[PDB]
Amino acid sequence: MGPGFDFAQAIMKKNTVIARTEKGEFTMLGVYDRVAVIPTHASVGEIIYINDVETRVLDACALRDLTDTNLEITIVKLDRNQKFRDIRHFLPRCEDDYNDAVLSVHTSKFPNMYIPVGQVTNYGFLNLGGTPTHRILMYNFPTRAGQCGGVVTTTGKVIGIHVGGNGAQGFAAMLLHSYFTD
């Protein structure tokens, strides 16, 4: 509908795959080369399905901050025959709040889904399904099951991935440039 949705659609079309684990189907954001991200609660193993193709997992790392607190981000390196467009220059360097964000999902259940979630708060600490979690972004939209792994963007920034909700608010794990230096 506008330049927020334009940037979101550009990321979805080139930089997402459908990831299936034993815990279900997730939006997965490809960041560069064969490196992607997914919520840690997807419980990535030695094998994962990518767009319904059996794929070896070359490495998987559940990130934690230097307080040793969950960040709910798993960085995955896929045994895929094709690289992702490098989008690391669209990642924020620092924790921040944002205006006018879009949450975008693409699964078998929710294809081509885009949600204007509005203002995003640097919320910080959240008890997420019983796990103390840091670097949480919050938006005031009643997000539903099936949205986990959804990409949170503003015009020109990829800021987070959706990791849960309380029925009234939705929560994303921050993406920071420093996660993906090589």
From Swiss-Prot:
Segments spanning the bilayer are none
Task: List localization entries.
Answer: Host cytoplasm
Tell me where in this chain the Peptidase C3 domain is found.
2-180
Instruction: Write out the catalytic residues in the record.
Output: 41 (for protease 3c activity), 72 (for protease 3c activity), 148 (for protease 3c activity)
Catalyses: Selective cleavage of Gln-|-Gly bond in the poliovirus polyprotein. In other picornavirus reactions Glu may be substituted for Gln, and Ser or Thr for Gly
In terms of superkingdom, the source organism counts as: Viruses
Subunit annotation = Interacts with host IFIH1/MDA5; this interaction inhibits host IFIH1.
What is its biological role?
Major viral protease that mediates proteolytic processing of the polyprotein. Cleaves host EIF5B, contributing to host translation shutoff. Also cleaves host PABPC1, contributing to host translation shutoff. Binds and inhibits host IFIH1/MDA5, thereby inhibiting the type-I IFN production and the establishment of the antiviral state. Cleaves host MAP3K7/TAK1, resulting in inhibition of TRAF6-triggered NF-kappa-B induction. Cleaves host TICAM1; this interaction allows the virus to disrupt host TLR3 signaling. Cleaves host IRF7, resulting in inhibition of type-I IFN production.
> What is the official name of this protein in its record?
Protease 3C
Naturally occurring in which organism (per UniProt): Human enterovirus D68
**Shown segment, full-protein numbering:** 1549 to 1729 of 2188
